[PDB]
UniProtKB/Swiss-Prot annotation:
<dbReference type="GO" id="GO:0005576">
    <property type="term" value="C:extracellular region"/>
</dbReference>
<feature type="region of interest" description="Important for interaction with IZUMO1">
    <location>
        <begin position="45"/>
        <end position="64"/>
    </location>
</feature>
<protein>
    <recommendedName>
        <fullName>Sperm-egg fusion protein Juno</fullName>
    </recommendedName>
</protein>
<comment type="function">
    <text>Receptor for IZUMO1 present at the cell surface of oocytes (oolemma), which is essential for species-specific gamete recognition and fertilization. The IZUMO1:IZUMO1R/JUNO interaction is a necessary adhesion event between sperm and egg that is required for fertilization but is not sufficient for cell fusion. The ligand-receptor interaction probably does not act as a membrane 'fusogen'. Does not bind folate.</text>
</comment>
<dbReference type="GO" id="GO:0031528">
    <property type="term" value="C:microvillus membrane"/>
</dbReference>
<dbReference type="GO" id="GO:0007155">
    <property type="term" value="P:cell adhesion"/>
</dbReference>
<keyword id="KW-0966">Cell projection</keyword>
<comment type="similarity">
    <text>Belongs to the folate receptor family.</text>
</comment>
<keyword id="KW-1015">Disulfide bond</keyword>
<dbReference type="GO" id="GO:0007342">
    <property type="term" value="P:fusion of sperm to egg plasma membrane involved in single fertilization"/>
</dbReference>
<feature type="disulfide bond">
    <location>
        <begin position="62"/>
        <end position="142"/>
    </location>
</feature>
<keyword id="KW-0449">Lipoprotein</keyword>
<keyword id="KW-0472">Membrane</keyword>
<feature type="disulfide bond">
    <location>
        <begin position="119"/>
        <end position="136"/>
    </location>
</feature>
<keyword id="KW-0278">Fertilization</keyword>
<feature type="lipid moiety-binding region" description="GPI-anchor amidated serine">
    <location>
        <position position="198"/>
    </location>
</feature>
<feature type="disulfide bond">
    <location>
        <begin position="106"/>
        <end position="156"/>
    </location>
</feature>
Length: 199
């Protein structure tokens, strides 16, 4: 699996489009991808629900989640579900492993979530699942994100089960992806996927 075989594709996960294509309408935080998207309008909207049915995973498990924080998590979903530029990190259903996120992306996400609350530092398993929605298990204290995720890297990496890696590279280095970008400026991740598909 290699080279161009990896550019402009969508992972084989349950919601993804079979190939990327333009979308006339995508919802709010997913707008940057509408040029060429792996997500449908439906998915984009479902990404913005209080508890997205895409994963049935509640971010409000500790009640106190700041809007600035939740915004980052929604953008992360759009990135995951919409990006046509993840091919080089796709691995076997398919998924993504260690997509390198630029330092600013992890930094800002962390900074904006410091004041919000969670009860676990590893979200990949060990939840109480009685309502079809996850709850904090017995003994898991709700504390600030900065307690369970001491650093930006912890947050980037452990919330999404190693889909993302906190890159030491910065934005516009050509060596890391942004999880969100201003639509007007064009997709800076195209160049990065292209680079990694060659090596
Ligand atoms: Cl992208």
């Amino acid at each position: 699996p290699w080279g161009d075989e990896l550019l402009n594709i969508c992972m084989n996960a349950k919601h993804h489009k079979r190939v990327p294509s333009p979308e006339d309408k995508l919802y709010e935080e997913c707008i940057p991808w509408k040029d060429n998207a792996c997500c449908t309008l439906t998915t984009s909207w479902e990404a913005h629900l209080d508890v997205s049915p895409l994963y049935n995973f509640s971010l409000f498990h500790c009640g106190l989640l700041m809007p600035g924080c939740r915004k980052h998590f929604i953008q992360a979903i759009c990135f995951y579900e919409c990006s046509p530029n993840l091919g080089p990190w796709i691995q076997p259903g398919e998924r993504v492993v260690n997509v390198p996120l630029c330092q600013e992306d992890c930094e800002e996400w962390w900074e904006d979530c410091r004041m919000s609350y969670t009860c676990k530092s590893n979200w990949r398993g060990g939840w109480d699942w009685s309502q079809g929605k996850n709850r904090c298990p017995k003994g898991a204290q709700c504390l600030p994100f900065s307690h369970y995720f001491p650093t930006p890297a912890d947050l980037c990496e452990k919330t999404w089960s190693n889909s993302f890696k906190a890159s030491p590279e910065r934005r516009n280095s050509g060596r890391c992806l942004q999880k969100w970008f201003e639509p007007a400026q064009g997709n800076p991740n195209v160049a990065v996927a292209r680079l990694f598909a060659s090596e």
